[PDB]
Design a binder for these strands. Structure first.
Ligand SMILES: [Cl-]
Ligand SMILES: [Mg+2]
Ligand SMILES: [Mg+2]
Ligand code: NA
Length: 329
DNA sequence: CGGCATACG
DNA sequence: CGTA
DNA sequence: GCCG
Protein backbone atom coordinates (compact mmCIF):
# COMPACT_ATOMS: atom_id res chain seq x y z
CA UNK A 1 0.00 0.00 0.00
CA UNK A 2 2.95 2.33 0.72
CA UNK A 3 5.98 2.29 -1.64
CA UNK A 4 9.46 2.44 -0.17
CA UNK A 5 10.80 5.55 -1.98
CA UNK A 6 9.34 9.01 -1.36
CA UNK A 7 9.36 9.75 -5.11
CA UNK A 8 6.83 6.94 -5.63
CA UNK A 9 4.02 8.55 -3.65
CA UNK A 10 2.41 11.98 -3.36
CA UNK A 11 3.40 13.95 -0.28
CA UNK A 12 1.31 17.11 0.31
CA UNK A 13 2.54 20.11 2.24
CA UNK A 14 -0.05 19.69 5.00
CA UNK A 15 -1.19 16.30 6.23
CA UNK A 16 -2.71 14.23 9.00
CA UNK A 17 0.27 13.22 11.15
CA UNK A 18 2.00 16.53 11.87
CA UNK A 19 3.01 15.88 15.48
CA UNK A 20 4.34 12.41 14.80
CA UNK A 21 6.40 13.53 11.81
CA UNK A 22 7.82 16.51 13.70
CA UNK A 23 9.06 14.24 16.50
CA UNK A 24 10.79 11.87 14.10
CA UNK A 25 12.39 14.85 12.37
CA UNK A 26 13.91 16.00 15.68
CA UNK A 27 15.62 12.62 15.92
CA UNK A 28 16.73 12.89 12.29
CA UNK A 29 18.21 16.34 12.88
CA UNK A 30 20.00 15.17 16.02
CA UNK A 31 21.46 12.21 14.09
CA UNK A 32 22.85 14.67 11.55
CA UNK A 33 24.47 16.73 14.28
CA UNK A 34 26.34 13.59 15.35
CA UNK A 35 27.37 12.68 11.80
CA UNK A 36 25.04 9.67 11.53
CA UNK A 37 23.73 10.20 8.01
CA UNK A 38 22.18 6.73 7.80
CA UNK A 39 20.08 7.27 10.92
CA UNK A 40 19.16 10.74 9.72
CA UNK A 41 17.86 9.25 6.47
CA UNK A 42 15.82 6.55 8.17
CA UNK A 43 14.15 8.98 10.57
CA UNK A 44 13.49 11.42 7.71
CA UNK A 45 12.04 8.62 5.56
CA UNK A 46 9.83 7.39 8.41
CA UNK A 47 8.56 10.92 8.99
CA UNK A 48 7.87 11.28 5.28
CA UNK A 49 5.85 8.04 5.20
CA UNK A 50 3.54 9.53 7.82
CA UNK A 51 3.15 12.70 5.74
CA UNK A 52 1.93 10.54 2.84
CA UNK A 53 -0.75 8.67 4.82
CA UNK A 54 -4.40 9.51 4.09
CA UNK A 55 -5.49 9.87 7.72
CA UNK A 56 -4.09 10.04 11.27
CA UNK A 57 -2.25 7.17 12.87
CA UNK A 58 -4.29 6.36 16.01
CA UNK A 59 -3.00 2.90 16.92
CA UNK A 60 0.36 1.17 16.78
CA UNK A 61 -1.09 -1.57 14.56
CA UNK A 62 -1.38 0.99 11.75
CA UNK A 63 2.42 1.03 11.39
CA UNK A 64 2.67 -2.69 10.60
CA UNK A 65 3.96 -3.07 7.08
CA UNK A 66 4.83 0.60 6.58
CA UNK A 67 8.33 1.05 5.17
CA UNK A 68 11.02 2.60 7.38
CA UNK A 69 9.22 1.73 10.62
CA UNK A 70 11.25 -0.63 12.73
CA UNK A 71 11.70 -0.98 16.46
CA UNK A 72 13.03 2.52 17.11
CA UNK A 73 10.67 4.62 15.00
CA UNK A 74 7.70 2.50 16.09
CA UNK A 75 8.56 3.03 19.76
CA UNK A 76 8.68 6.80 19.24
CA UNK A 77 5.20 6.75 17.72
CA UNK A 78 3.95 4.36 20.41
CA UNK A 79 5.06 6.72 23.18
CA UNK A 80 3.48 9.73 21.47
CA UNK A 81 0.19 7.83 21.01
CA UNK A 82 0.03 6.65 24.63
CA UNK A 83 1.49 9.65 26.50
CA UNK A 84 1.56 12.58 24.05
CA UNK A 85 5.34 12.86 24.38
CA UNK A 86 8.39 10.72 23.69
CA UNK A 87 11.07 10.85 26.38
CA UNK A 88 13.95 10.45 23.93
CA UNK A 89 12.65 13.31 21.78
CA UNK A 90 12.21 15.58 24.80
CA UNK A 91 15.70 14.75 26.08
CA UNK A 92 17.12 15.74 22.70
CA UNK A 93 15.07 18.96 22.63
CA UNK A 94 16.36 20.22 25.96
CA UNK A 95 19.96 19.04 25.49
CA UNK A 96 22.72 21.63 25.30
CA UNK A 97 24.33 19.77 22.40
CA UNK A 98 21.17 19.81 20.29
CA UNK A 99 20.26 23.42 21.07
CA UNK A 100 23.76 24.75 20.36
CA UNK A 101 24.30 22.69 17.21
CA UNK A 102 20.92 23.86 15.93
CA UNK A 103 21.73 27.49 16.67
CA UNK A 104 25.20 27.38 15.10
CA UNK A 105 24.23 25.41 11.99
CA UNK A 106 21.42 27.90 11.33
CA UNK A 107 24.12 30.51 10.63
CA UNK A 108 24.78 31.01 6.93
CA UNK A 109 28.35 29.81 6.37
CA UNK A 110 28.35 27.30 9.27
CA UNK A 111 27.77 23.58 8.78
CA UNK A 112 27.75 20.63 11.15
CA UNK A 113 31.54 20.25 11.07
CA UNK A 114 32.23 23.88 11.98
CA UNK A 115 29.45 23.95 14.58
CA UNK A 116 30.79 20.77 16.18
CA UNK A 117 34.32 22.19 16.37
CA UNK A 118 33.03 25.35 18.06
CA UNK A 119 30.93 23.23 20.44
CA UNK A 120 33.98 21.17 21.39
CA UNK A 121 35.91 24.43 22.00
CA UNK A 122 33.26 25.44 24.57
CA UNK A 123 31.32 27.99 22.51
CA UNK A 124 27.57 28.07 23.11
CA UNK A 125 25.94 31.38 21.99
CA UNK A 126 25.99 33.79 19.08
CA UNK A 127 27.64 36.37 21.30
CA UNK A 128 30.40 33.86 22.06
CA UNK A 129 31.10 33.82 18.31
CA UNK A 130 30.95 37.59 17.92
CA UNK A 131 33.56 38.06 20.65
CA UNK A 132 36.02 35.94 18.61
CA UNK A 133 35.70 37.34 15.07
CA UNK A 134 39.20 36.21 14.10
CA UNK A 135 37.85 32.68 13.82
CA UNK A 136 35.13 33.61 11.28
CA UNK A 137 35.12 33.66 7.51
CA UNK A 138 33.68 36.65 5.72
CA UNK A 139 30.65 34.51 4.85
CA UNK A 140 30.16 33.56 8.50
CA UNK A 141 30.53 37.19 9.58
CA UNK A 142 27.70 38.10 7.19
CA UNK A 143 25.60 35.18 8.40
CA UNK A 144 26.13 36.22 12.01
CA UNK A 145 25.40 39.90 11.43
CA UNK A 146 22.19 39.07 9.52
CA UNK A 147 21.15 36.10 11.66
CA UNK A 148 18.15 37.79 13.30
CA UNK A 149 16.57 38.88 10.01
CA UNK A 150 17.39 35.54 8.38
CA UNK A 151 15.60 33.73 11.24
CA UNK A 152 12.30 35.40 10.35
CA UNK A 153 10.25 33.79 7.60
CA UNK A 154 9.87 35.22 4.13
CA UNK A 155 6.24 35.52 3.05
CA UNK A 156 4.93 34.49 -0.34
CA UNK A 157 3.66 38.07 -0.52
CA UNK A 158 7.33 39.20 -0.45
CA UNK A 159 8.51 36.78 -3.14
CA UNK A 160 6.64 38.41 -6.03
CA UNK A 161 8.09 41.90 -5.54
CA UNK A 162 11.54 40.31 -5.28
CA UNK A 163 11.02 38.30 -8.45
CA UNK A 164 10.24 41.52 -10.30
CA UNK A 165 13.48 43.12 -9.14
CA UNK A 166 15.46 40.05 -10.25
CA UNK A 167 13.63 40.00 -13.60
CA UNK A 168 14.58 43.62 -14.26
CA UNK A 169 18.28 42.95 -13.69
CA UNK A 170 18.10 39.70 -15.69
CA UNK A 171 16.43 41.47 -18.61
CA UNK A 172 19.22 44.05 -18.79
CA UNK A 173 21.88 41.37 -18.43
CA UNK A 174 20.36 39.30 -21.27
CA UNK A 175 17.09 40.26 -22.98
CA UNK A 176 14.80 37.29 -23.29
CA UNK A 177 16.18 35.50 -20.26
CA UNK A 178 13.52 34.23 -17.87
CA UNK A 179 13.21 33.81 -14.10
CA UNK A 180 11.32 30.87 -12.57
CA UNK A 181 10.44 30.59 -8.88
CA UNK A 182 11.65 27.24 -7.52
CA UNK A 183 12.24 25.76 -4.05
CA UNK A 184 9.62 25.54 -1.37
CA UNK A 185 7.48 28.35 -2.73
CA UNK A 186 7.01 26.42 -5.97
CA UNK A 187 5.84 23.46 -3.80
CA UNK A 188 3.09 25.69 -2.35
CA UNK A 189 4.65 26.94 0.86
CA UNK A 190 3.26 30.19 2.14
CA UNK A 191 6.55 30.99 3.93
CA UNK A 192 10.19 30.05 3.69
CA UNK A 193 13.62 30.86 4.92
CA UNK A 194 14.88 31.85 1.50
CA UNK A 195 13.73 32.36 -2.06
CA UNK A 196 15.05 30.25 -4.94
CA UNK A 197 15.10 31.34 -8.61
CA UNK A 198 16.15 29.51 -11.77
CA UNK A 199 17.27 31.56 -14.79
CA UNK A 200 17.56 30.42 -18.41
CA UNK A 201 17.26 31.73 -21.97
CA UNK A 202 15.36 30.06 -24.84
CA UNK A 203 18.40 30.07 -27.16
CA UNK A 204 20.87 27.40 -26.10
CA UNK A 205 24.23 28.92 -25.21
CA UNK A 206 23.03 32.48 -24.66
CA UNK A 207 22.98 31.86 -20.89
CA UNK A 208 26.77 31.41 -20.78
CA UNK A 209 28.31 34.06 -18.56
CA UNK A 210 24.94 35.32 -17.40
CA UNK A 211 25.06 35.11 -13.62
CA UNK A 212 28.02 37.48 -13.07
CA UNK A 213 26.19 40.05 -15.21
CA UNK A 214 23.01 39.64 -13.14
CA UNK A 215 24.87 39.89 -9.84
CA UNK A 216 26.78 43.00 -10.87
CA UNK A 217 23.52 44.71 -11.81
CA UNK A 218 21.78 43.74 -8.55
CA UNK A 219 24.81 44.97 -6.61
CA UNK A 220 24.78 48.28 -8.50
CA UNK A 221 21.10 48.69 -7.54
CA UNK A 222 22.10 48.44 -3.87
CA UNK A 223 20.13 45.24 -3.33
CA UNK A 224 22.92 42.83 -2.40
CA UNK A 225 23.95 42.80 1.25
CA UNK A 226 26.27 39.83 0.68
CA UNK A 227 27.42 37.62 -2.18
CA UNK A 228 30.62 35.69 -2.75
CA UNK A 229 31.72 37.77 -5.79
CA UNK A 230 30.95 41.24 -4.39
CA UNK A 231 32.67 32.42 -13.93
CA UNK A 232 29.80 30.97 -11.90
CA UNK A 233 26.25 29.60 -12.23
CA UNK A 234 24.92 29.43 -8.64
CA UNK A 235 24.93 32.32 -6.20
CA UNK A 236 23.90 32.14 -2.54
CA UNK A 237 23.18 35.72 -1.55
CA UNK A 238 21.66 37.96 1.11
CA UNK A 239 19.31 40.54 -0.42
CA UNK A 240 17.71 43.74 0.90
CA UNK A 241 13.93 43.31 0.91
CA UNK A 242 11.65 46.34 1.53
CA UNK A 243 9.56 46.55 4.69
CA UNK A 244 7.26 49.29 6.00
CA UNK A 245 9.57 52.26 6.60
CA UNK A 246 12.69 50.08 6.45
CA UNK A 247 13.90 46.70 5.07
CA UNK A 248 15.11 43.27 6.09
CA UNK A 249 17.77 40.86 4.95
CA UNK A 250 16.58 37.76 3.06
CA UNK A 251 18.43 34.76 1.66
CA UNK A 252 18.08 34.36 -2.12
CA UNK A 253 19.55 31.63 -4.29
CA UNK A 254 20.04 32.27 -8.02
CA UNK A 255 20.88 29.52 -10.50
CA UNK A 256 21.47 29.61 -14.25
CA UNK A 257 20.95 26.61 -16.50
CA UNK A 258 21.00 26.15 -20.28
CA UNK A 259 17.53 25.51 -21.66
CA UNK A 260 18.48 21.93 -22.61
CA UNK A 261 19.04 21.27 -18.89
CA UNK A 262 16.18 23.41 -17.58
CA UNK A 263 13.81 20.49 -16.74
CA UNK A 264 16.55 18.78 -14.71
CA UNK A 265 17.48 21.98 -12.90
CA UNK A 266 13.84 22.83 -12.24
CA UNK A 267 13.27 19.34 -10.83
CA UNK A 268 16.37 19.48 -8.66
CA UNK A 269 15.89 22.98 -7.31
CA UNK A 270 12.19 22.46 -6.58
CA UNK A 271 12.95 19.86 -3.90
CA UNK A 272 12.10 18.85 -1.32
CA UNK A 273 15.64 17.84 -0.31
CA UNK A 274 14.45 14.40 0.75
CA UNK A 275 12.37 14.05 -2.42
CA UNK A 276 15.41 14.70 -4.60
CA UNK A 277 17.69 12.37 -2.64
CA UNK A 278 15.04 9.65 -2.91
CA UNK A 279 14.53 10.32 -6.62
CA UNK A 280 18.26 10.09 -7.36
CA UNK A 281 18.51 6.93 -5.22
CA UNK A 282 15.57 5.40 -7.08
CA UNK A 283 17.02 6.34 -10.46
CA UNK A 284 20.38 4.71 -9.73
CA UNK A 285 19.36 1.71 -7.64
CA UNK A 286 16.10 0.74 -9.39
CA UNK A 287 16.62 1.97 -12.94
CA UNK A 288 20.41 2.01 -13.34
CA UNK A 289 20.38 5.65 -14.45
CA UNK A 290 22.34 8.52 -12.88
CA UNK A 291 20.39 11.70 -12.13
CA UNK A 292 21.59 15.19 -11.27
CA UNK A 293 20.45 18.77 -11.87
CA UNK A 294 22.06 18.77 -15.32
CA UNK A 295 20.74 15.53 -16.84
CA UNK A 296 19.97 11.83 -16.64
CA UNK A 297 22.72 9.48 -17.79
CA UNK A 298 22.51 5.89 -19.01
CA UNK A 299 25.95 4.47 -18.07
CA UNK A 300 25.56 1.39 -20.28
CA UNK A 301 24.75 3.23 -23.51
CA UNK A 302 26.78 6.27 -22.41
CA UNK A 303 23.89 8.54 -23.42
CA UNK A 304 22.03 11.45 -21.83
CA UNK A 305 18.22 11.66 -21.93
CA UNK A 306 16.91 14.62 -23.50
CA UNK A 307 14.00 16.05 -21.59
CA UNK A 308 11.70 18.89 -22.52
CA UNK A 309 9.69 18.84 -19.27
CA UNK A 310 9.64 17.46 -15.77
CA UNK A 311 6.89 15.15 -17.06
CA UNK A 312 9.48 13.67 -19.47
CA UNK A 313 11.84 12.92 -16.59
CA UNK A 314 9.22 11.10 -14.50
CA UNK A 315 8.26 9.07 -17.61
CA UNK A 316 11.86 8.11 -18.32
CA UNK A 317 12.17 6.84 -14.74
CA UNK A 318 8.93 4.87 -14.90
CA UNK A 319 7.31 7.00 -12.18
CA UNK A 320 3.88 8.56 -12.12
CA UNK A 321 4.16 12.33 -12.42
CA UNK A 322 3.98 14.33 -9.21
CA UNK A 323 3.34 18.09 -9.40
CA UNK A 324 5.55 20.25 -7.15
CA UNK A 325 2.85 20.47 -4.47
CA UNK A 326 3.10 16.67 -4.02
CA UNK A 327 6.90 16.64 -3.64
CA UNK A 328 6.85 17.77 0.01
CA UNK A 329 8.60 14.65 1.26
C1' DC B 1 26.60 -7.17 5.34
C1' DG B 2 26.71 -2.52 2.10
C1' DG B 3 24.38 1.39 1.22
C1' DC B 4 22.50 5.73 2.19
C1' DA B 5 22.18 12.10 -3.88
C1' DT B 6 25.12 14.50 -6.29
C1' DA B 7 26.38 18.47 -7.64
C1' DC B 8 28.89 23.80 -7.58
C1' DG B 9 31.45 28.15 -4.84
C1' DC C 1 35.14 23.66 4.19
C1' DG C 2 30.63 26.07 2.66
C1' DT C 3 26.12 26.09 -0.32
C1' DA C 4 21.97 23.67 -2.77
C1' DG D 1 17.96 2.94 11.44
C1' DC D 2 16.29 0.49 8.29
C1' DC D 3 16.06 -2.07 3.49
C1' DG D 4 17.20 -5.54 0.38
CL1 LIG E 1 24.15 6.50 10.91
MG1 LIG F 1 14.04 27.80 -0.33
MG1 LIG G 1 17.52 27.92 -1.24
NA1 NA H 1 24.50 26.98 8.11
Amino acid sequence: WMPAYACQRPTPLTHHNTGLSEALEILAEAAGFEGSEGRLLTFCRAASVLKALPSPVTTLSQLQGLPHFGEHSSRVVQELLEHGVCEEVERVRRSERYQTMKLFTQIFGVGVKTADRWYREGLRTLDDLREQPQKLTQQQKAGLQHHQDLSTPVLRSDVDALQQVVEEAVGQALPGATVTLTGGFRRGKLQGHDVDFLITHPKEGQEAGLLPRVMCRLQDQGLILYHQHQAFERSFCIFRLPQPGSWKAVRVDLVVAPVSQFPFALLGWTGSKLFQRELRRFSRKEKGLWLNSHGLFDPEQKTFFQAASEEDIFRHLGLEYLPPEQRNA
